[model samples]
Target: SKLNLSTEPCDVSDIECISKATQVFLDNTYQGIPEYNIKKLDPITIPSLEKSIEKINLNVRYNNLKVTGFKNQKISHFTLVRDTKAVNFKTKVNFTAEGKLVIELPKSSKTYTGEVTIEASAEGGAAYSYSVKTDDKGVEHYEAGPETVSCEIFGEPTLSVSSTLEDALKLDSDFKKIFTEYGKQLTEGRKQTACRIVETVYAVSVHNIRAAARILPKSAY
Candidate 1:
């Protein structure tokens, strides 16, 4: 009688593993910026004062992902792409004046949403962290962690203020001037908020990839 032997199953490929890992990361996470408020005031006068305040809330959603670069159960490099959509913003403002020109202004609130694209990449070779284990069936498992990752944006993100908000600002020359003067800052703030959401998603994806690597067998390829 000839002797018989069985070989262990091949390890999962880097591309497949990383892809699945990212899906896991996406499924488990929610990204957004907390609500924030700002206040502005005009110079004080003997019998008059003016004040204004703005409050904003932001939220983002991710869609469509493309992954590249995985072979021999190892990733020398990788690129991930996705779009941030349904980006929503809510803003409220109030103005009040007292004394010589005693007046009270109604509070205004407006909501708007937009979209943007993001791309991220990473180079392999840097040691990734991992852990090992086996199931009752004797199958090997691996989990991994990446030390670093980088990201970039494809183009300028666009944001449209609510028409109600726009018209309200046009009602007062001073209000119009305030928005015009701070337009650049407002644009920068939106850009920063979008970037933050992308960075968080990228970081979590990388973390899941490393975690997945640890469960894979040494012979996986």
Candidate 2:
């Protein structure tokens, strides 16, 4: 039997209703697909770096900080709605990253374990149409294609940073400046990384949806 959406007349006009209903439809439609988990995702590697700070009279060095672990990956909000012939999507993601950072100073070399929490959002739309057909086995198939997807970061990302050597560097002015600069760099770096991840994931998501549509009957929507 075909999945039914006729039981409750879905209020497509209501954004909340549409969002909820779409999530339910997709969740059921793609029941066997794996859930997205950043912990299982590959780590992002950063090469070793070294810098000399003459203004602060300190030599700074970075020993290849690798973002090795991600936890608490979540899709806080996701919504898809039809607009004319196009489909719009908005989503928010949150995750935490853990890494090892090695820093060398004038007096000593220190290794610190770093943890950062991030929250990012993305919004975009695709323009396309779809059609449904049935095979000999009476199985419905849908074809949706030629979608131009463009997604971007929605807002300022929230970031929390922590390190094992927080107190040791508090008394040094040069260390403080370096710490502040590092924060700024981290913010920009995370923003870029988040944007790329969102764009890639959403594009793949579109592909997955289209693939799922191929097996979903028309009435399922």
Candidate 3:
């Protein structure tokens, strides 16, 4: 018996053959294919670190003092674009410490939250997360930022205060004189005020970003 499968008539056997062939073709072509769009990520740029250490004296009892001092290791100049979603950024450092320490940002932003990770390595690394916001003038800053999270790496040199202590002691007398006197001599050779205005602008941007992101209040948006 013959049956019509479409406007154009087809023999009874031909209709079954056509259906089977179409199924086979689709199965072969569409095997192992996903129904979702796959996203590829670009390589993230690692930020550079500008660090300075200021040795400050801490109050301790005479017996407890044991020549105790602190090195205020400040690392700055971390910057990244404010993507809408959460993204992790890593900055490397050379820390002579173990375990993780967290610092809170003084201000909160309306838009973003920020955090930092300082991993223990032969070279230390800072991993941070932040929430960022923009002001009325469309300027952005870190609402909260750079709460250092540190991890200790085994088999590395331990932090020592010998050099720092020596420098600090000298700063009171000989070092001060030499440093002060050399300033004029050092500046005399080049432009009297070879101020790095270009770097100043860059430094300002980084600082502003950090400050703006640090203070925003948390929100679901």
Candidate 4:
């Protein structure tokens, strides 16, 4: 006896319904695959560094600050749509970083133990095309390939340091300049990560989305 396993079918032209339906599948399976999503990143180890400003009589020392990567680093806010040119995808990442900070002042001549915190929103998109094929299992497969994936950073990442130290540093003109640059520097660092972040998805996408249709909706639907 043959049992019918029919499910509600979404028309290809009905992208809204299709995206919504497929979203559930991705949400369910994303966590199971590290290649699909990352909840946390191991602490990033930065080598010890020291800098001195003779004119300001100040020295900044870093004791190998360890970056506490995003507590939530995953593909969220996912949207899939079709364009005249290709398929489009959009995603967002919750970004935050923390690390130790040390500073030395000849006048005070003290090594202050403090920390740096940064929070930002990272977002990006991808556009791609696919080809169709039938496997030995007699299953039609749509494989996505050669996507144009990249990250675009919007707005400056909020940066902060220990309150006392921040106020003290701000008291001096040079100290303030150095401290403000901290924000800019971290922003630049994130720019580098923006590239790697999308590439992570790209790596997983290649293997997992080679048979995109079957890969996303894992179970029969």
RMSD to true structure for each model, in Å = 17.4, 8.3, 24.2, 8.0
Candidate 2 ranges with C-alpha deviation above 4 Å: 1-20, 26-86, 92-115, 122-128, 131-140, 146-148, 152-155, 165-186
> 1 or 2: which has the higher TM-score?
2
Ranking of predictions according to lDDT? 4, 2, 1, 3
The residue-level lDDT of candidate 2 at 32 comes to 30
Q: Report residue 55 deviation for candidate 3 (angstroms).
A: 27
| Per-residue lDDT of 8 in model 4 | 67
Ranking by TM-score: 4, 2, 1, 3
* lDDT tens digits, residue span 1-221, model 3: 27755433223234344334322322332221222221111111123222211221111111111110011112322233345222222222333221211111112211111222222222122334554556456655435344343322334333223444435534444334444655444233222111111122223223333442344332211
Whole-model lDDT per candidate: 0.34, 0.49, 0.28, 0.53
TM-score of each: 0.37, 0.47, 0.22, 0.49
Q: Report the Cα lDDT for residue 71, model 3.
A: 18
Q: RMSD of model 1, in Å?
A: 17.4
lDDT minimum window of 10 residues, candidate 3: 60-69
Among these predictions, the greatest lDDT belongs to 4
Worst 10 residues of 2 by lDDT: 36-45
Task: Judging by lDDT, tell me the better candidate of 1 and 2.
Answer: 2
